[PDB]
Amino acid sequence: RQLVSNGFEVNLPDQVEVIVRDLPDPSKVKEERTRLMGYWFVHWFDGKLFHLRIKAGGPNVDGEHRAIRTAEHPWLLRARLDDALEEALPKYAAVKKRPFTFLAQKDELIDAAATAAGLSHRLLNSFKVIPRFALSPKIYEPVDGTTRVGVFVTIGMRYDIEASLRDLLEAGIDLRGMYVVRRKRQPGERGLLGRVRAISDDMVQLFEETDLASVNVNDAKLEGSKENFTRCLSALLGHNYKKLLNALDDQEAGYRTGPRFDDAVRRMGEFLAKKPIRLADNINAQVGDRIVFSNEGQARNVRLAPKVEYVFDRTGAKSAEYAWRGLSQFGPFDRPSFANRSPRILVVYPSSTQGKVENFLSAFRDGMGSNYSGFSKGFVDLMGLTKVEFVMCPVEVSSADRNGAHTKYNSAIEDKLAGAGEVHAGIVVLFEDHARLPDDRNPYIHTKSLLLTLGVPTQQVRMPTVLLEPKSLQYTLQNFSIATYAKLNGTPWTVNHDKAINDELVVGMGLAELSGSRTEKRQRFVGITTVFAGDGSYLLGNVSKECEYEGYSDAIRESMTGILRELKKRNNWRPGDTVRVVFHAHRPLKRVDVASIVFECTREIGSDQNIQMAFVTVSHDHPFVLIDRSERGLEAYKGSTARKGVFAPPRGAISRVGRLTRLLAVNSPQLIKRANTPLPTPLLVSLHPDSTFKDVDYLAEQALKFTSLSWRSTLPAATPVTIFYSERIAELLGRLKSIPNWSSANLNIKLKWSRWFL
RNA sequence: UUACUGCACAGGUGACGA
DNA sequence: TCGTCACCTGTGCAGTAAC
Ligand SMILES: C[As](C)(=O)[O-]
Ligand SMILES: C[As](C)(=O)[O-]
Ligand SMILES: C[As](C)(=O)[O-]
Ligand SMILES: [Mg+2]
Ligand SMILES: [Mg+2]
Ligand SMILES: [Mg+2]
Ligand SMILES: [Mg+2]
Ligand SMILES: [Mg+2]
Ligand SMILES: [Mg+2]
């Protein structure tokens, strides 16, 4: 019946008395806040300046007096609540404001972890993990047309290495290459400094410097990254460092796991509710009960979408709750029509790895047998092919080569293909040490580039994967096979969808931001992905081949109008038919872009048909969490004491925050990885207010389904493929744009139906 | 770069207004 | 240029693979 949130009701006054000045230029605001400081809360909104009196006594303020009622204008007190929460928690210094964010005053988890594991080191006290709480006052709608303000509690961990760089050098951590940040953050200045090249007297030598090429040892510390933590502590702790991380994991789980998080939120509410919260001298707020999403009595705030069905035939008869279980039984969705039943696959690999690659290829093509039931059949039988023919392309290249690996791979590929006839796909095996080389000499990207140019999609793979123990390898090979099949134009599966209307197009856009280093400014690229409603299931459409960020809204507009035109020709819509277009992204579109997109599509389809249009943003990092106290979780593994996903809402749970907003649970206890995995965070789904199609519950469930459409993996994706695929495309095409001899010429020819971006 | 998941840090950025 | 509310994107490390 009920999903509990991480938020509490805030009992506010019905009305607050305010003073208003017209203030068209908002630049005067900062100085005016400063003048009236301590005595007035000041807030700029809609060309006017609102003043709420906090404390009797001057300065005085000229303006028009007005009663601001909370039910009608909750943004005023919501804003004041941001400041009042800080003032209500005086013993807690704000590490950030709006939302007020602060550290636990005592708890420090590295010390606690060292004690539980029985470790120690004279430098351990300089490594800190401190619980970090935030309090976000948020407007929500307990029912349509009525707003309220709630305070939402979130918890993270601050990682910080306060150790002097001098003390870390001795001994004997190699600080070279490590990123380093300012120790005191001057207001509005960058934290990042650069990487450590060397340290001498009192100065650090920086490369990839953000400003000055050197900084005093006293003004810099290591950035609190997991990388720096692991580098430092493994050097200091050696064999025992693993004991510390697992202990640290247990510690953090004591804050993050379902019942532990619910308890921590409970405890925070009790603390906040102990006294009134002072909105002004005269005016008090009161933190009340935990906010719930339920269906009682006038509220309709929670529902459970049905299980997504993975579908493997056009009749809908062959379906399954799980991708792999389904693919195992039925084979792929397009098995009866799949053209290339004898694919020829080029295999490019370092000559020294021959034996390992053959073992991998055999496992891949012919399976691992019934001792490894996750991948028994192998690619050929799995997909219902007749066979796979490998043309072996060894490369004389060693891992120690870091400057000429890519040229050796590409020369070998060119020489092999020149005499080998036609290949339909490639597998490229990479040394770990080459995987993350800069792009000008990175063999992943150069071989990707060359083969794509030639119209040959690739599935690449790093040697540590090639060398996985069999129990892990079987799962690797599931994901490898699915993506490879789709790279061969295959359609592994679809997801259930019933009719509803005459045609439905979903287009997504995704962003990548590329640079050669953290110091070089990131360049933006976009990708576009389309999905069509099919007979009884969704079908993946075509994909963008151009990636320029500038003019991206024209790109969306042209994609949609082009597609609508073709859909109409193809399907021959009858007068009165209804067509729906949905847009997905991780950010909202501009109102002006929505107007322009809606105008153009409406004009393109014309007046014979009805058109519905929705613009949706999918958010991951918001302050909302769902707790299902009825959920006991599952054993961490068969069949232990520990449980995983305790209190995790079922997948497909959808809660109403407001008219335009839903929370969508995606990670159920089954999908939750381990006992220490935190209570999952739902996706926030938000409808653009200018949308003409308004059913955000439908749109939330549609997003859920599209999460199951990913052919990169048997497990669902973190975000719908309309966005996810677009990000992968934008990143690849963005990187390829800088690789010499790259051409997109085959993306819409040989690769038009290839899912080359997986 | 089989992936999924989590987290951390860093960079900032988007949308709405006047 | 501004205020205001909000959260996105990149990178690296670790545990696990919906029955
Ligand atoms: C209907 As329910 C609160 O179990 O998602
Ligand atoms: C000690 As407390 C900030 O969780 O109330
Ligand atoms: C699949 As083979 C190259 O070991 O015959
Ligand atoms: Mg206090
Ligand atoms: Mg406790
Ligand atoms: Mg099998
Ligand atoms: Mg290697
Ligand atoms: Mg009508
Ligand atoms: Mg891939």
GROMACS .gro file of N, CA and C in nm, chain A residues 562-673:
model
  336
  562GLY      N    1   1.161   1.435  -4.029
  562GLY     CA    2   1.201   1.340  -4.132
  562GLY      C    3   1.136   1.206  -4.104
  563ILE      N    4   1.139   1.167  -3.978
  563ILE     CA    5   1.086   1.037  -3.939
  563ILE      C    6   0.934   1.032  -3.952
  564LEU      N    7   0.867   1.140  -3.910
  564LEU     CA    8   0.721   1.147  -3.920
  564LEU      C    9   0.677   1.133  -4.065
  565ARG      N   10   0.747   1.202  -4.155
  565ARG     CA   11   0.718   1.193  -4.298
  565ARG      C   12   0.727   1.051  -4.351
  566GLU      N   13   0.834   0.981  -4.315
  566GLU     CA   14   0.852   0.843  -4.356
  566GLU      C   15   0.751   0.749  -4.291
  567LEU      N   16   0.720   0.772  -4.164
  567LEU     CA   17   0.625   0.687  -4.090
  567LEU      C   18   0.488   0.696  -4.157
  568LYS      N   19   0.451   0.817  -4.197
  568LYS     CA   20   0.323   0.840  -4.262
  568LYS      C   21   0.313   0.768  -4.397
  569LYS      N   22   0.412   0.790  -4.484
  569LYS     CA   23   0.423   0.716  -4.610
  569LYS      C   24   0.413   0.566  -4.589
  570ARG      N   25   0.498   0.513  -4.501
  570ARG     CA   26   0.502   0.371  -4.474
  570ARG      C   27   0.365   0.320  -4.428
  571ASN      N   28   0.310   0.385  -4.327
  571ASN     CA   29   0.196   0.329  -4.258
  571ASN      C   30   0.064   0.377  -4.312
  572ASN      N   31   0.069   0.487  -4.386
  572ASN     CA   32  -0.048   0.539  -4.455
  572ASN      C   33  -0.161   0.567  -4.355
  573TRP      N   34  -0.134   0.660  -4.263
  573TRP     CA   35  -0.225   0.695  -4.154
  573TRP      C   36  -0.362   0.737  -4.208
  574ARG      N   37  -0.470   0.689  -4.146
  574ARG     CA   38  -0.604   0.731  -4.186
  574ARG      C   39  -0.638   0.865  -4.120
  575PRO      N   40  -0.723   0.946  -4.185
  575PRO     CA   41  -0.779   1.065  -4.119
  575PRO      C   42  -0.833   1.030  -3.981
  576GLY      N   43  -0.797   1.107  -3.880
  576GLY     CA   44  -0.845   1.078  -3.747
  576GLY      C   45  -0.748   0.994  -3.667
  577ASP      N   46  -0.648   0.934  -3.732
  577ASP     CA   47  -0.548   0.856  -3.657
  577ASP      C   48  -0.471   0.947  -3.561
  578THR      N   49  -0.424   0.890  -3.452
  578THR     CA   50  -0.349   0.968  -3.356
  578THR      C   51  -0.202   0.924  -3.355
  579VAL      N   52  -0.112   1.021  -3.358
  579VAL     CA   53   0.031   0.996  -3.357
  579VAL      C   54   0.091   1.061  -3.232
  580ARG      N   55   0.182   0.991  -3.166
  580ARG     CA   56   0.247   1.042  -3.047
  580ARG      C   57   0.397   1.047  -3.068
  581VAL      N   58   0.455   1.158  -3.025
  581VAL     CA   59   0.600   1.173  -3.024
  581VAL      C   60   0.644   1.205  -2.881
  582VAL      N   61   0.736   1.124  -2.831
  582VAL     CA   62   0.801   1.144  -2.702
  582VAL      C   63   0.949   1.179  -2.720
  583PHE      N   64   0.998   1.277  -2.643
  583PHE     CA   65   1.141   1.311  -2.638
  583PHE      C   66   1.200   1.280  -2.499
  584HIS      N   67   1.319   1.218  -2.497
  584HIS     CA   68   1.393   1.183  -2.375
  584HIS      C   69   1.530   1.250  -2.368
  585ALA      N   70   1.566   1.306  -2.253
  585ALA     CA   71   1.703   1.352  -2.230
  585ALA      C   72   1.730   1.362  -2.082
  586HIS      N   73   1.856   1.383  -2.046
  586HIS     CA   74   1.889   1.400  -1.905
  586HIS      C   75   1.870   1.543  -1.857
  587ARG      N   76   1.834   1.634  -1.949
  587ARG     CA   77   1.805   1.773  -1.917
  587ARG      C   78   1.676   1.818  -1.989
  588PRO      N   79   1.608   1.921  -1.938
  588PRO     CA   80   1.487   1.969  -2.005
  588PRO      C   81   1.519   2.055  -2.127
  589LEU      N   82   1.434   2.050  -2.230
  589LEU     CA   83   1.448   2.141  -2.344
  589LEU      C   84   1.398   2.282  -2.309
  590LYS      N   85   1.445   2.381  -2.385
  590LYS     CA   86   1.397   2.517  -2.370
  590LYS      C   87   1.254   2.521  -2.419
  591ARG      N   88   1.173   2.605  -2.356
  591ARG     CA   89   1.036   2.628  -2.402
  591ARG      C   90   1.035   2.668  -2.550
  592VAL      N   91   1.134   2.746  -2.592
  592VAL     CA   92   1.135   2.793  -2.730
  592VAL      C   93   1.164   2.677  -2.825
  593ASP      N   94   1.239   2.579  -2.777
  593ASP     CA   95   1.268   2.462  -2.860
  593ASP      C   96   1.148   2.370  -2.865
  594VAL      N   97   1.077   2.356  -2.754
  594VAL     CA   98   0.955   2.278  -2.755
  594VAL      C   99   0.855   2.340  -2.855
  595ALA      N  100   0.832   2.472  -2.848
  595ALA     CA  101   0.739   2.540  -2.940
  595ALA      C  102   0.772   2.514  -3.085
  596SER      N  103   0.899   2.532  -3.117
  596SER     CA  104   0.948   2.514  -3.252
  596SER      C  105   0.936   2.368  -3.299
  597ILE      N  106   0.964   2.274  -3.211
  597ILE     CA  107   0.957   2.132  -3.245
  597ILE      C  108   0.812   2.090  -3.264
  598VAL      N  109   0.726   2.134  -3.173
  598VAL     CA  110   0.582   2.106  -3.182
  598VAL      C  111   0.519   2.168  -3.308
  599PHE      N  112   0.555   2.292  -3.339
  599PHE     CA  113   0.504   2.357  -3.461
  599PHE      C  114   0.540   2.277  -3.586
  600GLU      N  115   0.669   2.248  -3.603
  600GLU     CA  116   0.719   2.175  -3.720
  600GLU      C  117   0.664   2.035  -3.739
  601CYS      N  118   0.650   1.959  -3.631
  601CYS     CA  119   0.594   1.825  -3.641
  601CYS      C  120   0.445   1.834  -3.674
  602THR      N  121   0.377   1.932  -3.616
  602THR     CA  122   0.234   1.945  -3.638
  602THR      C  123   0.211   1.982  -3.784
  603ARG      N  124   0.294   2.072  -3.835
  603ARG     CA  125   0.285   2.112  -3.974
  603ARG      C  126   0.319   1.993  -4.063
  604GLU      N  127   0.423   1.919  -4.028
  604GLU     CA  128   0.462   1.805  -4.110
  604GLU      C  129   0.354   1.696  -4.119
  605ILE      N  130   0.297   1.656  -4.006
  605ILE     CA  131   0.194   1.554  -4.013
  605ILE      C  132   0.066   1.610  -4.079
  606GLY      N  133   0.039   1.739  -4.060
  606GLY     CA  134  -0.077   1.804  -4.118
  606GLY      C  135  -0.205   1.778  -4.040
  607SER      N  136  -0.316   1.832  -4.090
  607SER     CA  137  -0.441   1.835  -4.014
  607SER      C  138  -0.526   1.708  -4.020
  608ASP      N  139  -0.489   1.611  -4.103
  608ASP     CA  140  -0.567   1.487  -4.108
  608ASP      C  141  -0.554   1.401  -3.983
  609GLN      N  142  -0.447   1.420  -3.907
  609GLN     CA  143  -0.422   1.336  -3.790
  609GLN      C  144  -0.412   1.417  -3.662
  610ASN      N  145  -0.440   1.352  -3.549
  610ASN     CA  146  -0.413   1.411  -3.418
  610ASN      C  147  -0.269   1.384  -3.374
  611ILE      N  148  -0.201   1.485  -3.321
  611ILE     CA  149  -0.068   1.461  -3.267
  611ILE      C  150  -0.055   1.496  -3.119
  612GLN      N  151   0.004   1.403  -3.044
  612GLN     CA  152   0.037   1.418  -2.903
  612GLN      C  153   0.189   1.422  -2.886
  613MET      N  154   0.240   1.519  -2.811
  613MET     CA  155   0.385   1.533  -2.793
  613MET      C  156   0.426   1.549  -2.646
  614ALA      N  157   0.523   1.471  -2.602
  614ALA     CA  158   0.573   1.481  -2.464
  614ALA      C  159   0.724   1.499  -2.458
  615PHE      N  160   0.769   1.586  -2.369
  615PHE     CA  161   0.911   1.610  -2.352
  615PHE      C  162   0.950   1.578  -2.208
  616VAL      N  163   1.039   1.481  -2.194
  616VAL     CA  164   1.064   1.416  -2.066
  616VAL      C  165   1.210   1.432  -2.028
  617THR      N  166   1.236   1.469  -1.903
  617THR     CA  167   1.372   1.453  -1.854
  617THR      C  168   1.385   1.343  -1.750
  618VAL      N  169   1.493   1.268  -1.762
  618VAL     CA  170   1.523   1.162  -1.670
  618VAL      C  171   1.640   1.209  -1.584
  619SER      N  172   1.617   1.220  -1.454
  619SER     CA  173   1.718   1.268  -1.359
  619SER      C  174   1.761   1.154  -1.269
  620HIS      N  175   1.892   1.148  -1.240
  620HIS     CA  176   1.947   1.047  -1.150
  620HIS      C  177   1.988   1.100  -1.011
  621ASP      N  178   2.040   1.222  -1.005
  621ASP     CA  179   2.101   1.278  -0.885
  621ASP      C  180   2.016   1.388  -0.820
  622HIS      N  181   1.899   1.349  -0.772
  622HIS     CA  182   1.802   1.438  -0.708
  622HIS      C  183   1.796   1.396  -0.559
  623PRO      N  184   1.721   1.469  -0.475
  623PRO     CA  185   1.732   1.433  -0.334
  623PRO      C  186   1.624   1.336  -0.285
  624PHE      N  187   1.560   1.261  -0.374
  624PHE     CA  188   1.447   1.176  -0.338
  624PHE      C  189   1.484   1.027  -0.325
  625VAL      N  190   1.438   0.963  -0.218
  625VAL     CA  191   1.453   0.818  -0.211
  625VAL      C  192   1.327   0.747  -0.160
  626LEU      N  193   1.304   0.628  -0.215
  626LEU     CA  194   1.188   0.547  -0.183
  626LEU      C  195   1.226   0.431  -0.090
  627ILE      N  196   1.149   0.414   0.016
  627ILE     CA  197   1.169   0.307   0.113
  627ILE      C  198   1.045   0.217   0.120
  628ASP      N  199   1.063   0.087   0.096
  628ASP     CA  200   0.952  -0.007   0.110
  628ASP      C  201   0.971  -0.093   0.236
  629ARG      N  202   0.910  -0.051   0.346
  629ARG     CA  203   0.934  -0.118   0.473
  629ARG      C  204   0.881  -0.261   0.477
  630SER      N  205   0.798  -0.295   0.379
  630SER     CA  206   0.744  -0.430   0.367
  630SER      C  207   0.843  -0.524   0.298
  631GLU      N  208   0.954  -0.471   0.248
  631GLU     CA  209   1.048  -0.552   0.171
  631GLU      C  210   1.164  -0.602   0.258
  632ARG      N  211   1.177  -0.734   0.270
  632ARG     CA  212   1.274  -0.795   0.361
  632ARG      C  213   1.407  -0.824   0.294
  633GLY      N  214   1.410  -0.810   0.162
  633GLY     CA  215   1.532  -0.833   0.088
  633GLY      C  216   1.550  -0.980   0.056
  634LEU      N  217   1.666  -1.014   0.000
  634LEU     CA  218   1.694  -1.152  -0.038
  634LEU      C  219   1.827  -1.186   0.025
  635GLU      N  220   1.855  -1.316   0.039
  635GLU     CA  221   1.985  -1.359   0.087
  635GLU      C  222   2.093  -1.306  -0.007
  636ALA      N  223   2.205  -1.260   0.049
  636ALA     CA  224   2.313  -1.201  -0.030
  636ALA      C  225   2.363  -1.299  -0.136
  637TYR      N  226   2.351  -1.427  -0.103
  637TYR     CA  227   2.381  -1.536  -0.192
  637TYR      C  228   2.323  -1.658  -0.121
  638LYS      N  229   2.292  -1.763  -0.195
  638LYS     CA  230   2.238  -1.884  -0.134
  638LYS      C  231   2.345  -1.951  -0.047
  639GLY      N  232   2.318  -1.964   0.083
  639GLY     CA  233   2.198  -1.912   0.145
  639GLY      C  234   2.234  -1.858   0.282
  640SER      N  235   2.269  -1.730   0.288
  640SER     CA  236   2.334  -1.674   0.406
  640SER      C  237   2.242  -1.601   0.505
  641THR      N  238   2.304  -1.549   0.610
  641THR     CA  239   2.235  -1.468   0.710
  641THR      C  240   2.207  -1.329   0.656
  642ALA      N  241   2.310  -1.267   0.598
  642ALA     CA  242   2.302  -1.133   0.541
  642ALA      C  243   2.196  -1.125   0.433
  643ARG      N  244   2.139  -1.007   0.418
  643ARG     CA  245   2.041  -0.987   0.314
  643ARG      C  246   2.081  -0.868   0.228
  644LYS      N  247   2.033  -0.865   0.105
  644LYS     CA  248   2.061  -0.752   0.017
  644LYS      C  249   1.929  -0.689  -0.023
  645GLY      N  250   1.931  -0.560  -0.059
  645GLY     CA  251   1.810  -0.491  -0.099
  645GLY      C  252   1.696  -0.493   0.002
  646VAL      N  253   1.728  -0.498   0.131
  646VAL     CA  254   1.626  -0.478   0.234
  646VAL      C  255   1.565  -0.339   0.219
  647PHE      N  256   1.431  -0.333   0.220
  647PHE     CA  257   1.354  -0.208   0.204
  647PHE      C  258   1.354  -0.147   0.062
  648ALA      N  259   1.407  -0.218  -0.036
  648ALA     CA  260   1.410  -0.167  -0.174
  648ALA      C  261   1.277  -0.188  -0.243
  649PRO      N  262   1.215  -0.080  -0.292
  649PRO     CA  263   1.089  -0.090  -0.367
  649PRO      C  264   1.105  -0.180  -0.487
  650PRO      N  265   0.996  -0.245  -0.528
  650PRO     CA  266   1.002  -0.329  -0.646
  650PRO      C  267   1.031  -0.246  -0.771
  651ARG      N  268   1.088  -0.311  -0.871
  651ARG     CA  269   1.116  -0.249  -0.999
  651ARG      C  270   0.983  -0.215  -1.064
  652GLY      N  271   0.968  -0.090  -1.105
  652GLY     CA  272   0.843  -0.053  -1.169
  652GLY      C  273   0.749   0.020  -1.076
  653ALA      N  274   0.788   0.031  -0.949
  653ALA     CA  275   0.712   0.115  -0.856
  653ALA      C  276   0.722   0.258  -0.905
  654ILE      N  277   0.608   0.326  -0.909
  654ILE     CA  278   0.604   0.463  -0.958
  654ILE      C  279   0.531   0.550  -0.857
  655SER      N  280   0.599   0.653  -0.805
  655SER     CA  281   0.537   0.742  -0.707
  655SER      C  282   0.520   0.882  -0.763
  656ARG      N  283   0.413   0.947  -0.719
  656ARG     CA  284   0.380   1.081  -0.763
  656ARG      C  285   0.437   1.182  -0.667
  657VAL      N  286   0.523   1.268  -0.718
  657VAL     CA  287   0.576   1.379  -0.640
  657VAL      C  288   0.489   1.501  -0.667
  658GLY      N  289   0.460   1.525  -0.794
  658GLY     CA  290   0.380   1.639  -0.834
  658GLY      C  291   0.308   1.611  -0.964
  659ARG      N  292   0.237   1.710  -1.016
  659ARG     CA  293   0.163   1.691  -1.140
  659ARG      C  294   0.254   1.647  -1.256
  660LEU      N  295   0.375   1.701  -1.260
  660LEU     CA  296   0.465   1.678  -1.374
  660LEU      C  297   0.577   1.578  -1.345
  661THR      N  298   0.576   1.521  -1.225
  661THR     CA  299   0.693   1.447  -1.178
  661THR      C  300   0.659   1.313  -1.114
  662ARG      N  301   0.733   1.209  -1.153
  662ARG     CA  302   0.721   1.078  -1.091
  662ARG      C  303   0.859   1.027  -1.050
  663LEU      N  304   0.862   0.949  -0.943
  663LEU     CA  305   0.977   0.868  -0.906
  663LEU      C  306   0.956   0.726  -0.956
  664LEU      N  307   1.059   0.666  -1.015
  664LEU     CA  308   1.049   0.534  -1.077
  664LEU      C  309   1.157   0.446  -1.016
  665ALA      N  310   1.118   0.335  -0.953
  665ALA     CA  311   1.216   0.244  -0.894
  665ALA      C  312   1.264   0.149  -1.004
  666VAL      N  313   1.395   0.130  -1.016
  666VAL     CA  314   1.446   0.043  -1.121
  666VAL      C  315   1.525  -0.074  -1.066
  667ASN      N  316   1.595  -0.054  -0.955
  667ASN     CA  317   1.678  -0.158  -0.896
  667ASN      C  318   1.610  -0.237  -0.783
  668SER      N  319   1.545  -0.347  -0.820
  668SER     CA  320   1.478  -0.432  -0.722
  668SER      C  321   1.581  -0.516  -0.641
  669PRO      N  322   1.537  -0.581  -0.531
  669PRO     CA  323   1.631  -0.665  -0.455
  669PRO      C  324   1.702  -0.773  -0.537
  670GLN      N  325   1.632  -0.835  -0.631
  670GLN     CA  326   1.695  -0.930  -0.724
  670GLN      C  327   1.816  -0.870  -0.797
  671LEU      N  328   1.802  -0.745  -0.842
  671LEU     CA  329   1.907  -0.677  -0.920
  671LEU      C  330   2.015  -0.615  -0.832
  672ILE      N  331   1.986  -0.595  -0.704
  672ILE     CA  332   2.083  -0.537  -0.613
  672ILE      C  333   2.201  -0.634  -0.592
  673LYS      N  334   2.323  -0.581  -0.598
  673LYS     CA  335   2.441  -0.666  -0.613
  673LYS      C  336   2.481  -0.741  -0.485
   0.00000   0.00000   0.00000
